[PDB]
Design a protein around this motif. Sequence first.
Motif, PDB file in Angstrom:
ATOM      1  N   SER A   1      28.785  38.950  37.303  1.00 49.95           N
ATOM      2  CA  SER A   1      28.142  38.757  38.595  1.00 49.95           C
ATOM      3  C   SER A   1      26.641  38.594  38.400  1.00 49.95           C
ATOM      4  O   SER A   1      25.992  39.452  37.791  1.00 49.95           O
ATOM      5  CB  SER A   1      28.430  39.933  39.529  1.00 49.95           C
ATOM      6  N   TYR A   2      26.096  37.496  38.917  1.00 49.90           N
ATOM      7  CA  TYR A   2      24.673  37.215  38.789  1.00 49.90           C
ATOM      8  C   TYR A   2      24.248  36.310  39.933  1.00 49.90           C
ATOM      9  O   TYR A   2      25.077  35.664  40.581  1.00 49.90           O
ATOM     10  CB  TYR A   2      24.347  36.563  37.439  1.00 49.90           C
ATOM     11  N   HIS A   3      22.939  36.267  40.172  1.00 48.71           N
ATOM     12  CA  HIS A   3      22.357  35.443  41.231  1.00 48.71           C
ATOM     13  C   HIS A   3      21.291  34.548  40.616  1.00 48.71           C
ATOM     14  O   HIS A   3      20.253  35.038  40.160  1.00 48.71           O
ATOM     15  CB  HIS A   3      21.768  36.310  42.345  1.00 48.71           C
ATOM     16  N   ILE A   4      21.544  33.241  40.606  1.00 45.12           N
ATOM     17  CA  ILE A   4      20.593  32.281  40.049  1.00 45.12           C
ATOM     18  C   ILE A   4      19.442  32.123  41.037  1.00 45.12           C
ATOM     19  O   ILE A   4      19.603  31.519  42.102  1.00 45.12           O
ATOM     20  CB  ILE A   4      21.261  30.934  39.753  1.00 45.12           C
ATOM     21  N   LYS A   5      18.281  32.663  40.689  1.00 46.63           N
ATOM     22  CA  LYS A   5      17.105  32.581  41.539  1.00 46.63           C
ATOM     23  C   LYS A   5      16.240  31.390  41.131  1.00 46.63           C
ATOM     24  O   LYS A   5      16.398  30.816  40.050  1.00 46.63           O
ATOM     25  CB  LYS A   5      16.301  33.881  41.467  1.00 46.63           C
TER      26      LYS A   5
ATOM     27  N   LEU B   1      19.922  48.645  38.149  1.00 44.25           N
ATOM     28  CA  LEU B   1      19.692  48.059  36.828  1.00 44.25           C
ATOM     29  C   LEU B   1      19.872  46.547  36.920  1.00 44.25           C
ATOM     30  O   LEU B   1      20.910  45.982  36.571  1.00 44.25           O
ATOM     31  CB  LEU B   1      20.629  48.666  35.791  1.00 44.25           C
ATOM     32  N   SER B   2      18.833  45.874  37.401  1.00 45.58           N
ATOM     33  CA  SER B   2      18.839  44.424  37.515  1.00 45.58           C
ATOM     34  C   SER B   2      17.680  43.836  36.726  1.00 45.58           C
ATOM     35  O   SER B   2      16.583  44.407  36.697  1.00 45.58           O
ATOM     36  CB  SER B   2      18.751  43.977  38.973  1.00 45.58           C
TER      37      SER B   2
ATOM     38  N   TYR C   1      18.896  36.226  37.904  1.00 43.99           N
ATOM     39  CA  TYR C   1      18.672  37.619  38.276  1.00 43.99           C
ATOM     40  C   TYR C   1      20.032  38.296  38.410  1.00 43.99           C
ATOM     41  O   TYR C   1      20.767  38.038  39.369  1.00 43.99           O
ATOM     42  CB  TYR C   1      17.873  37.683  39.578  1.00 43.99           C
ATOM     43  N   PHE C   2      20.373  39.151  37.447  1.00 46.83           N
ATOM     44  CA  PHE C   2      21.677  39.801  37.448  1.00 46.83           C
ATOM     45  C   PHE C   2      21.520  41.314  37.525  1.00 46.83           C
ATOM     46  O   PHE C   2      20.573  41.890  36.981  1.00 46.83           O
ATOM     47  CB  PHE C   2      22.517  39.410  36.218  1.00 46.83           C
TER      48      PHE C   2
ATOM     49  N   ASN D   1      17.009  25.736  35.454  1.00 51.35           N
ATOM     50  CA  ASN D   1      18.233  26.521  35.578  1.00 51.35           C
ATOM     51  C   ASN D   1      19.470  25.708  35.221  1.00 51.35           C
ATOM     52  O   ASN D   1      20.486  26.282  34.814  1.00 51.35           O
ATOM     53  CB  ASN D   1      18.364  27.073  36.998  1.00 51.35           C
ATOM     54  N   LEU D   2      19.407  24.382  35.369  1.00 53.48           N
ATOM     55  CA  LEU D   2      20.549  23.544  35.024  1.00 53.48           C
ATOM     56  C   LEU D   2      20.787  23.513  33.519  1.00 53.48           C
ATOM     57  O   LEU D   2      21.925  23.317  33.078  1.00 53.48           O
ATOM     58  CB  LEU D   2      20.343  22.127  35.560  1.00 53.48           C
TER      59      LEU D   2
END
Lengths: 66, 49, 96
Positions: free
Chosen positions: B19-23, B39-40, B28-29, B1-2
């Motif tokens: 807006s997104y969430h780094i899983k 809608l993700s 995961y956005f 992810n880096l």
Amino acid sequence: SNGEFIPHIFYSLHQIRKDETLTGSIRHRLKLCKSLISENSEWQDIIHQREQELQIKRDVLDDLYR
Amino acid sequence: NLTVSIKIALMNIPKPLNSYHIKNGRIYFTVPNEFEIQLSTVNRQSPLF
Amino acid sequence: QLYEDLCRYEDTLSKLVESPNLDIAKDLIRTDEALFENVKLLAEYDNIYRNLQKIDKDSEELDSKTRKILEILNECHDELXXXXXXXXXXXXXXXX
């Protein structure tokens, strides 16, 4: 845009204002000016943003040294 | 992810995707819609050059 | 505003060839001055845009450098840990 093509029109326009081919030439240049300007406080704001990136990175390296 | 976060960090992400969430191993956005879901999507790749 | 300036001249001349007064010429003069000023301002704005582009390029360069550093880091992590310590313990148990 280019500012050298405007006095050339103003000379003849002065002559016509003092007194078909003369005004025809004047319009022939004015059309080229229309296409030229058509082809070609705000930027200040933008300037600051760009530098914002530079500043953050400098602060990181300064975090390494100190 | 880096590795993905810096290229995604440099490019011009559209406004509805800010807006997104780094899983754990993915990004995961989301964006809301309907059909009993949202809608993700999950994104992950490898190249960067 | 720069285009209406160019249109007024053509309209006024087109009305002068057919005939048509003195006021419209003064209007043409003030129009002239306004057009000139607008052009100059536009040029300055263009230059400032160029500067912005330069700064963008610099930022891109720094990003590339950071990426390279990260890559070297991942290599250094893949080079090196407890398994070797366990094999050293079992090796000590085998030497004695």
